[PDB]
From a paper:
The influenza nucleoprotein (NP) binds to the viral genomic RNA and is essential for its replication. The NP forms homo-oligomers along the vRNA by inserting a loop, located close to its C-terminal tail, into the body domain of a neighbouring NP. NP is a multifunctional protein that influences the structure of the vRNA, with essential roles in nuclear trafficking of vRNAs and replication. However, mutational analysis and structural information suggest that RNA binding is mediated by a basic groove located between the head and body domains.
Despite its ability to bind to and be stabilized by 14-nucleotide RNA, no RNA could be resolved from the crystals produced in its presence. The NP structure consists of head and body domains composed primarily of α-helices. The major difference between the structure presented here and those previously determined is the position of the 73–90 loop, the deletion of which produces an approximately fivefold decrease in RNA-binding affinity. We observe that the C-terminus of the NT60 R416A NP folds towards the RNA-binding groove.
Author numbering: 21 to 389, 418 to 451, 462 to 497
The structure:
Amino acid sequence: NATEIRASVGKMIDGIGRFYIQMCTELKLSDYEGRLIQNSLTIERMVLSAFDERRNKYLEEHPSAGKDPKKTGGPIYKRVDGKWMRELVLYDKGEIRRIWRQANNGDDATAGLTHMMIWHSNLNDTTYQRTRALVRTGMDPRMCSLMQGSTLPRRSGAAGAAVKGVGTMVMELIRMIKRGINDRNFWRGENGRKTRSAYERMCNILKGKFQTAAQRAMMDQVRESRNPGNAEIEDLIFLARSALILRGSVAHKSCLPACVYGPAVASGYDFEKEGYSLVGIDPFKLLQNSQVYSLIRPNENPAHKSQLVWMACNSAAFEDLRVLSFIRGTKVSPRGKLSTRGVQIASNENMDAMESSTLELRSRYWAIRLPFDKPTIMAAFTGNTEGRTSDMRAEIIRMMEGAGVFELSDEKAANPIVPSFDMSNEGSYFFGDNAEEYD
């Protein structure tokens, strides 16, 4: 049905909220501290860590010597008379798993864990830069607009495949080949047909994201190359360049932090009875009636820190800023022009110099489901005229050289608003990027 899918998604949100409510009490957090997204991020990672048990499926964590492997934790931020202090907590993974299951009526409710994994992915995509991770692979750093989901853990299942961008899959495939060429046994033994089945699916996953017959036909030859080498790497890079113009279709799910679902459940909002959808107005309505706080570093502009959180909640980092600027009712600027840094607080930072602020995650309209940068057409058309030409590579080039919104009062899309884009401002979030690189 279309209403029972809204009910199963609803009970998932309920579980996340009821979980967050419970942990806010066990850690004896204020209501303000409970709505602090920094505490939400820590509470989120811990439960993911409790079920991950060092598989790097729900998250990735760096090892530390002497740390009991059977316990999880993170920094919890608490305030007294306006001064924040970091406190590191340690909980047994087993107990975290029990609280999560108890909050989900006894079920493992793994879909709720992945839900928070996506949110972490969206936030990282919006906060950090992967230009070094691209350059250290042979890819063009100007493919940043293709890297949705590139921070998802190494062993994320098909869960993350849906939101992984063309650029993310291309690199993943390239990496597999680069150690298939520097280790004989990679495709040998059943340890090899282990990785061949994965190579085939990852190829067909990326094939499915392409929406031109020529792009898919060339992925077929990459898939059915019995031993891929530096030849297939070259054409995967070519496909990535074609994806800057003949963009592929990628999922964009609006996953909000637990500090939003948490208080909403305490309000008495039973998401199972009334329903929920990651697509449409419900995620906008949660944020509009939300109240989330965030720590602020000296000289960080609270308005910009709000934008990057709002953009991560809506998974819009890879959309045109002129379009989102009209929806938000305010200019949503490129990352390079944001006078702020990440939401997470490093271990080295001075906590006495930290302030709080209400995040502005509100929008003026909502949406469902413009020329290209010069940086992107330059990257797309730096093809290897140098060397190999082909069949469908020449056709794809030919195709490349050829190249709703509603008011929140409009609850089910009656009067669509024709948009007004101001062509003055840049369209890509990554134009003149200034942000930290991931890890």
